Amino acid sequence: TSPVIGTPWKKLNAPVSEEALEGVDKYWRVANYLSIGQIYLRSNPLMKEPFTREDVKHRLVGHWGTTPGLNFLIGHINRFIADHGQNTVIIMGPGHGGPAGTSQSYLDGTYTETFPKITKDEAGLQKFFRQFSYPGGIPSHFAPETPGSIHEGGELGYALSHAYGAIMDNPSLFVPAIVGDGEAETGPLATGWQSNKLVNPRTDGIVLPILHLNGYKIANPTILSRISDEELHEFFHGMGYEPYEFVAGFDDEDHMSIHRRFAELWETIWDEICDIKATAQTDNVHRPFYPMLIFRTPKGWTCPKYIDGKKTEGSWRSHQVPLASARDTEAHFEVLKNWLESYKPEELFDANGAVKDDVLAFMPKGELRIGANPNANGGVIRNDLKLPNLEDYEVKEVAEYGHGWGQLEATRTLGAYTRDIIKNNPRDFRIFGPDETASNRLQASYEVTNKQWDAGYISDEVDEHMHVSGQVVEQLSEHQMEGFLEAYLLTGRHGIWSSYESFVHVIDSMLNQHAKWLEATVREIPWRKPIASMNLLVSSHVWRQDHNGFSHQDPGVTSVLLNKCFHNDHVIGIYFATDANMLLAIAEKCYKSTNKINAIIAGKQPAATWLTLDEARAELEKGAAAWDWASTAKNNDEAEVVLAAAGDVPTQEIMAASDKLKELGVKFKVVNVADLLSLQSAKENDEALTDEEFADIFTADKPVLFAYHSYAHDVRGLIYDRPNHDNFNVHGYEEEGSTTTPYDMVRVNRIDRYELTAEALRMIDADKYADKIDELEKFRDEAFQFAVDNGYDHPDYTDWVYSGVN
Template sequence: MALPTSHPAPSRPGPPPIGFPDWSHAARQAAESVPGQAISALWRALNHLCAAQLYLEDNPRLARPLRPADVKEDPRGHWGVCPPVNWMLAHLGPLTAWRPAGSELLVLHGAGHAGPSALAHAYLNSTLHLTGRGPGWSMPELRALIARFPHPETFGGEITPLIPGARHTGGQLGPALAIAQGMVLDAPHRLVVPLIGDGELETGATAAAWLARRALTGSGHGAVLPVVLANGLKMGGPSLLATLTQDEVRAYFTGLGYQTFLHDGTDISGFRRLLADALTRIRPLGDKGRQPVIVLTMPKGHTGPEQVAGRKIAGTPAVHKTPLRNPRKDDAEFAALAAWLASYRPAELFTTQGRPTDLVRQALPGPPPQPGPDKPTAPIAARGPQSWPLTSTMIRERAGRGGFRLFSPDEITSNRLKLTDDGSLPPWASEILNEEICHAWLQGYTETGRDALLATYEAFAPVNTSLLVQHLKHRSLHYAAGHSGLPNINYLITSLGWRNTYTHQNPGLVSSMLETENGSVHIYTPADAMRAAAVLAVMLSGRDRVNFLITDKHSSTSFPPDPFRDELTVGAAVWPHLSHQGAPDLVLASAGDVPARELSSAATLLLRTTHPEIKIRYLHVNDLAVLGPDPQWPYALPKPEFTRLFGTDTPVLMAVPTHPGAVRALLAARGEAKRFNVVGYLDPGRPITPQGLLEHCGLSASTLAARAALMLKEYGR
């Protein structure tokens, strides 16, 4: 792709808003205080450490001539994206050190394969703990960094939160730009620089995120400076971006509302001027004017070997992982590796004690700021009328405390959420017709310590299944790194299929989440709107959970509130007003408002009329996750509590709002599937009325009563 080194300087913009950090001034201060030679040294140090991690067992400084014994037998990892990422890290280091008072600069790695870069950067910042002696600079630490890569039992070889300073798991390909947008919402002090691979530009999440910023209105936000790593290649061949001419690249981003700054990474002083110029034009996220985007056209694998023994390497997919296949045993490759590593002059970059030299340290940013909430939050007590509007009241009250955002794919009004008295959209609520972007915004917002809620249709929520599974992995690694206290991930799932058209019937997200057997997952199925509002209040004040609240926006039936305390704290509770004293002949268990309505009607109107001699115990399950076994589910019902509720040999008819198979799997893991008859959603295969759907699924009051009677007969009760 023949692109120029820089974009012609356009006319100067006006001053930034009052109170918005002057990032261009920080860039000028950094340029005056940190020489270009220091930037170059840091870039070389990062590149050397990346290549060394892939290939070396020892001799990290090349203090003596390289030997085959210094080289790994099985080189692994990814090289190609590291040089352009390192270029950006080297230039952002001084800017971070000279950032405006009270401000924060975060780098978000969209390219997950830049794991060696993140590890090298963490080592140079003295935040990486490798040998058990604590983080710091030493020759044992430096040897451990290169010899242990890809660190299969500690950090791994790709971008994860196990690496200090990483806030995004690279396996989530595509949402980095939207996550960056979520990070700066309501945080005017924060600048986030997402590093976006040109392959990522081909994903739907990234493509939508460029335009998605226009949905984020209001003031008081931070800024996002996207950097596109236009290196020309994906893993297997040329990227689509590489097929565009320079004019087409400009036209593409201009059409999206951005001002393009192009550079090829060959001129440090020129890039520093370009960066300062881009920062002059940075504006808060809610500003509808043109925002800068940097397009770095440095070739993939730049500074690596060009060719070996007639085999071309540069400009081919060979640079994606390890360009040299087996330099320990191949003489030509060994010579190429020795020359490659020597080109960085590592003895100038690291002391004999493994410390970066003074020249390198001039460009380092220092330890990254520790993530934390921008505004404190506190639990909110449920109150108000027992009706669906109470859910809106809970959301409005939580928003009034600050540090909160609601995201929805154009479904706030449709889901009957009244967020203002006049029905308008408040500044803390954002809509865009894209489930993935909503999740990425929520992820970025919560990752920086604030509470958020995603409200969506039940049928569309499964679109985010892959993102959620990846985010569960991300959080698991976050906790494995010794961190905790992240705000909850909260989904409000309504517009349920029980009242919707055939194409809008899909409770599949819940099944996928339960199948992960991740103990942080909670599937809340309250029986009425009052309970739903109280559950929502708890969700919005908690930490380290991934919550899904399933509730019907048309909910009108209310049940006695007395058992709800146990429903909320234990996860399930007996409803005395529908239960007999003593050992039951049959247990009826509901989960969710629609099943509670139908099963309670079956219990009161039918069973007690047709079988008055039968003793019934009725209970409601408020969190499906408690049905699973311990230890997979940390909040599972203990065995004595499970027995108290369900008995040991009593038949149980359970009505759920989800696919029944997911609940059966939880019970089967307890060894309890045989006596449980679980009824839930079954695809009717055609359009059908709401009542017809209940009949088809066996969830109407009459079909539930008939099934209960059959179960009593089968069990000889």
């Protein structure tokens, strides 16, 4: 679970010391200098004679506009941390404020600790400035390469979901969450403000949202800075916050008055938070209004007010670089030089180029430093789950009655397994869902926990399984669920969320950003320890969406996740749960895995159970497997056709087609694919099937009929250099469907058992089986006409049991 770090929720009981404020003001100057040096300078960091245009980088990359505001806030937060011993993680929402994050880590000493070549002297400072956003250096954003980041904030709008995920079951953790005022215009951010209705001030930590109201986004004003101050305050009060406003930099107030004013307001806010935390030790049934800070400052604060007659400080014109080419004109170089000198670096750095002791003597030390807090490197906190014994949940009836027995709902099995994970791993495992946990049949967890709800309660007739604390969280937002879980994992804990398949697409871009985090971490950031995997139960899938119908039918999550499978990163798992015993085997592998995004595509409809758990574990280790109990070919040369399937509904239709083929005497081989990346090119993926293993399973030369759960294009693209790939005939979802019966869903997508039987006969000999083929095609129209007439599927479809069942 989360470590208790420091002395949390302590009031100061004194004014902020004038010396600490002189610390904060020097911090802001030197962090601003070091932010500018990283953007503009390739050499001569301390502007020794001669400082000329040759010291300027040839291409200016990075963002000034948000940066001096972030440096201000970070300076004051560091003072706060050292004075109070508070366990603190910052969410840097305007993540293009990269130079502030790297400057912080350089000043707190964690940068040189982590990156020993970047020393705390003039040659290390030169390397520090050159490397920023440079070929072979470090990124422009607050990337996972930076000590202290858990959030790159490249794609905007997840700051608050990540902040609130971080503090769940983390009652000593304080998260100051800096939100762009442009970022507050996004969808995901806008709903993220309501997360305070889903956290509990006793059992969870505290988020302080900080609205970086600098007035501007890239080229536009921001909505929230142009509405009235009364509207802006009512807005935050309507969302359960008590808003505090700070305004600075729009007049000629000296910088030391600003710092005193801010430290006074910070400590007032903090006294309000400590009151909330102290009250919650007794009463955590009544939701407080949490503080939030509206930080109103000019964009690009302390850049030159006018460059070439255009307003730059307090404008969108300061967003990227205020000064656009200091290398090309003497005039513009002089502006850069005077700007760099306005921070007076002669007082900040000593003769050797180290930042002076009195600049940083207010800073926190040890694990309380922003770049050294374990919650910001949450792999160091994370332990293996205590997992229950997987055979306790095995469907034993396959071994009793035969492969293909029963009408179980496979996700109920996962639900019972996850219930006992939650029971064995209190405060360490969570379930998230967008109001779909019961619907996706995971509600056995309510026997051991509750849905965390901190809005109002009204009646025990409606409010079953809800409590102000609990390990299940539901809000109708895929962005919230994915974002909560992502930060729960990045801070060292574990969990799962579930979703209807077609709505996974809502968070495709969040999955992309989590995968780029993971890809960069496993390629090049070894000091960042492995975090628990992002586990996604994909249920209510396309084949059993014949009640919501056509516009809820999109299995396309698989195509998205296949674009993050390169360079042997192995950050993606794509798993088709064939039945409940395969779902168990998959779930245990995903629950033991680290540094991944695991998609688990499982049906929740009643379906057969095909495998025992020991067979499921064997198929899962390779990824695909022949089912010799289902083949009537007895090796690869007497097979006429290979019937392969990936997914529970393709498996059902292929197994029903193999029974009709067997009745015709045909010699075939049956294959199941549980793990989709096992089919990936053996050159590209060293966990995938070797080409010899692939040709034993599939064959060297026989026609393979392949029923696939998602778009056939996924498979055709993956097997492009596999042996015998020209003989594959992939059937997937093909954008057909309506609100209809289950048979009609498989029929219109050409994956029903009769079409698959017919396709196998056309592949074997379309001419000797011509009579029987015309017979199967006529039944397809007749079983559809039965559904229209009677209101339910034809009994030859619905009553079918595999012949292996005794």
